[PDB]
C-alpha cells in the first residue's frame, strides 16, 4: 500500500526512489526492491485519541517495564493535542 | 649532542657497515629469483635495490643509519630464506597501482590532493 514512481519503483517511508537517470537501479535487475508497506505515518492516524481526565498524566507503551519511559505531558492545548516522542499517541483533557 | 652511540661513530665509519649489506643483497637477487620463481630477470631487481639505497642517502645521523642497516638485515634474513613467498619479495615494486601524476595539472583531475 505504497506510492510509486513514474519509472515504476517502490517508495519507502521516505521519498527515496532513484531518478530515471541513475545507474543504481541495476542492482534491482532480475531481483526486486525490498520494502515495508507499513508506513507508521499511515498507521498512527488510524488510532483514536485517548480522551482522559486530569490535564497531566503518564503514558506507557503497554507495560511499564516494557516500553515508553514514563514521560508526562501538559494537556492545556485545547486547540491541538499533546504527543509523546517515543510513541505517536495523542491525548485530550475531556473538559 | 653527547648522545649514546650504537654500533658506530660519526657517519663515515657507518658507511662501510652499509656496504656489508649491499654486499649481500647484490648477490641475493639471482638466488631468490631462481629458487622461488619470479618475473624479473635479475637486473630491474637490482635497480630496485639501489633505488632504495638512493632514497635514504639524505640521512646525516649515524644513529639512524646504524638502525636502517638492521631492518635491511631482517628483510635479508627473511629473503635469504624462504620465509617469504613470491608475493612478498615482489611487493616493493608497486607494479600494479598506477603512479599518480607528479606534476600539478593532472594531479587534480582526480583527487583533492594537495
Amino acid at each position: 500500500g505504497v506510492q510509486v514512481s513514474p519509472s515504476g519503483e517502490k517508495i519507502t517511508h521516505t521519498g527515496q526512489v532513484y531518478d530515471e537517470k541513475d545507474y543504481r537501479r541495476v542492482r534491482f535487475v532480475d531481483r526486486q526492491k525490498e520494502v515495508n508497506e507499513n508506513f507508521a505515518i499511515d498507521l498512527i492516524a488510524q488510532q483514536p485519541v485517548n480522551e482522559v481526565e486530569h490535564r497531566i498524566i503518564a503514558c506507557d507503551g503497554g507495560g511499564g517495564a516494557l516500553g515508553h519511559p514514563k514521560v508526562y505531558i501538559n494537556l492545556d492545548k485545547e486547540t491541538k493535542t499533546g504527543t509523546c516522542g517515543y510513541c505517536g499517541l495523542q491525548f485530550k483533557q475531556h473538559h | 649532542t653527547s648522545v649514546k652511540p650504537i654500533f658506530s661513530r660519526d657517519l663515515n665509519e657507518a658507511k662501510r657497515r652499509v656496504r656489508e649489506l649491499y654486499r649481500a643483497w647484490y648477490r641475493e637477487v639471482p638466488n631468490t629469483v631462481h629458487l622461488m620463481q619470479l618475473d624479473i630477470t635479475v637486473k630491474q631487481g637490482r635497480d630496485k635495490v639501489r633505488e632504495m639505497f638512493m632514497k635514504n642517502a639524505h640521512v646525516t645521523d649515524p644513529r639512524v643509519v646504524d638502525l636502517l642497516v638492521i631492518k635491511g638485515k631482517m628483510e635479508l634474513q627473511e629473503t635469504i630464506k624462504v620465509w617469504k613467498q613470491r608475493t612478498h619479495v615482489m611487493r616493493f615494486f608497486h607494479e600494479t597501482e598506477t603512479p599518480r601524476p607528479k606534476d600539478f595539472l593532472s594531479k587534480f583531475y582526480m583527487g583533492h590532493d594537495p
Binding site: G64, A65, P69, K70 | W83
Partner: protein, 360 residues
Amino acid sequence: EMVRKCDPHIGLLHRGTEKLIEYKTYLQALPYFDRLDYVSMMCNEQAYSIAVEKLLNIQPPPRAQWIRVLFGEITRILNHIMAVTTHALDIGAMTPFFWMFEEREKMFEFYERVSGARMHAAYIRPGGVHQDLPLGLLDDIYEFSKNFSLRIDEVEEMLTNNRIWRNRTVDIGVVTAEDALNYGFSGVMLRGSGIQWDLRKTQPYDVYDQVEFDVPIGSRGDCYDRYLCRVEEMRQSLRIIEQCLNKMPPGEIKVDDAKVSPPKRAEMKTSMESLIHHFKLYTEGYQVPPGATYTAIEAPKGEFGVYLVSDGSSRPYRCKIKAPGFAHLAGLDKMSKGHMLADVVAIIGTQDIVFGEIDR
C-alpha cells in the same frame, strides 16, 4: 630423521587487538578477551573485570563473585577437554573427542541459557555480571555434574594405562623445573614438573578462599604427568562445583552503583538518574582513574594476566594481554631436543596452543 633445531613463525593470526582497544572503552572492549583463549572464554573476562575492579576499587557482590567462580571453573573443564582430546587427535585417538563433544555441548547450553549465546558470552563485565541466571539451570548442573565424573574416568579407563599412549608420551619433553621459571611457563607446564604453585591458593582473589580443593602437582616432568594433571584438574572442579553449588548466597548482581554497572532495565525507565547513567555508561562509560595493574589468573593455560593501563578518559591507554602460552611456545625449541617429529605434535598439545592468546 631426528630433530635438533625448530623454529615457529608465530604471526599468522595477529590482529592488532592491543592497538584496537586503545580506541574503544572498557565496556566496549570486553568481548575481545573472549577471543584470546577462544576455547575458554569466561576466565579471560574473569581477569579483565578484575583489572578494572582493582582500579575502580570495588569488590563485586558475593552472588556475582560466586557465579564468576562457577563458570570460572567450567571454562577450566573446557580447555582440558579441548587439549586432552586434540592432543589425542593429532597423536591419533579420535574417539574420546566425540564422546566429550556431546558432553561439551551440554556445557555450552549452560552459557546459552545463562548468557545470550553459546560461546562468546559477554556475561562477565567489570561491575560483576550483567544478568542473573534462570530457574531451570541449577537443578540441571547437578544432574550433569553427577554424570560427568564418570565420563572422565570412563576415558581414563582407556588411555592412561594405554601403551600406545604411555610410551608415545612418557619421558617426552623433559622439562627442568628451574628452567621453566627462566622461561616463565607458570601454568600447568611447571606444576607438572613439581613446582608447587597455584594463584588460586597462593594469591587468592575471588571467593576461592572457602572451597576445600587441591592442586594436582606433577612430578617426573613429561607430557603424561602434565596429562594426569590436566585430567585431575577436571575432576577437582567437581569438588569445587559441589562446594560452589550448594551454598550460593541470594544477593545482587551488576554492582549496586549505577556508575559502574548499568541499572535494572525496569528502573532506568522511571527513575531518572538510572536513565542518565544508562545513557552515559553505554556511550562514555566508567571514567576510570589513571593507574596501572598487572593482574593474573591461572586459566587452563596458566598465568593469564593483563597489564591494563588507564587514563582519566573513559577509554584505556595500551592494555596488554599476558598470553601464558606465549612463553610456553618460546620453550618449544629447547624441550624438543633429542626428540623426533611425531611427539612434537604431542608437544603442541601439551603446551595448549589455543592460538588466539599466542597471536596478538
